[PDB]
């Protein structure tokens, strides 16, 4: 697809939409995750010992926010510059994933959880051109973190 001026414009627009409702979109995101894979629950400190996904847990919200921000920033960087840049942050990310017992096969779990979360976020404005644009941006960012985990192990 690339990332035409027209596609980037489409990701920015859709992320602004996500940020607009953190406690919802983040609890939704954790449920889509536990739907695709239930065992994932024991991983998260704030999910252990609980029976359901907490809805107002600051720890959980802050956590999931950070996750989507990172995928958006990735799309813009692709349109302007043509790439996704690896920094300190992406590297520390790779460490903590490993401490917590996270693997590569976990990634399509979280991707489908994010496309489905954004399809849910933009509703009728959804286009092939937009799906194509977030897909390209996740794929490109996952490529980068998986790369850093393997390096933290």
Nearer to ligand HEM, 7 or 138 (CB): 138
Q: How far is the CB of 124 from ligand HEM (least distance, A)?
A: 27
Using rule CB under 6 A, residue 36 touches ligand HEM: no
Q: How far is the CB of 136 from ligand HEM (least distance, A)?
A: 13
Give Dmax over CA atoms of the chain in angstroms: 47
Using rule CB under 6 A, residue 40 touches ligand HEM: yes
Q: Nearest-CA neighbor of 14 among 138, 102, 139, 140?
A: 138
Nearer to ligand HEM, 125 or 147 (CB): 147
Residues with Cβ < 8 Å from 110, sequence gap 6 or more?
33, 67
DSSP assignment, residue 85?
-
Candidates 12-20, 22-30, 95-103, 119-127 — which segment interacts with ligand HEM by CB under 6 A? 95-103
Q: How far apart are CA 140 and CA 75, in angstroms?
A: 8
Question: The tokens of 16 are what?
Answer: 């602004």
Q: How far apart are CA 82 and CA 2, in angstroms?
A: 8
Using rule CB under 6 A, residue 100 touches ligand HEM: yes
Contact 75, 11 (CB under 8 A): yes
Residue from 3, 10, 75, 102 binding ligand HEM (CB under 6 A): 102
Dihedral of alpha carbons 39, 42, 45, 47, sign: positive
Residue from 6, 45, 50, 81 binding ligand HEM (CB under 6 A): 45
Q: Say whether 97 counts as a known binding-site residue.
A: yes
Binding footprint of ligand HEM on the chain (CB under 6 A): 40, 43-46, 62-63, 66-67, 70, 93, 96-97, 100, 102, 106-107, 110, 141-142, 145
* Residues of the binding site for heme b: 45, 66, 97, 100
């Amino acid at each position: 697809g690339a990332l035409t001026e027209s596609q980037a414009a489409l990701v920015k627009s859709s992320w602004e939409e996500f940020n607009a409702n953190i406690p919802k979109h983040t609890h939704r995101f954790f449920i889509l995750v536990l739907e695709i894979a239930p065992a994932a629950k024991d991983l998260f400190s704030f999910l252990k010992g609980t029976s359901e996904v907490p809805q107002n847990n600051p720890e959980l919200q802050a956590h999931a926010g950070k996750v989507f921000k990172l995928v958006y920033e990735a799309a813009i960087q692709l349109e302007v510059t043509g790439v996704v840049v690896t920094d300190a942050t992406l590297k520390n990310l790779g460490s903590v994933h490993v401490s917590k017992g996270v693997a590569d096969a976990h990634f399509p779990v979280v991707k489908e959880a994010i496309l489905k979360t954004i399809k849910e976020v933009v509703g009728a404005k959804w286009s092939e051109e937009l799906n194509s644009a977030w897909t390209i941006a996740y794929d490109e960012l996952a490529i980068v973190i998986k790369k850093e985990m393997d390096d933290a192990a």
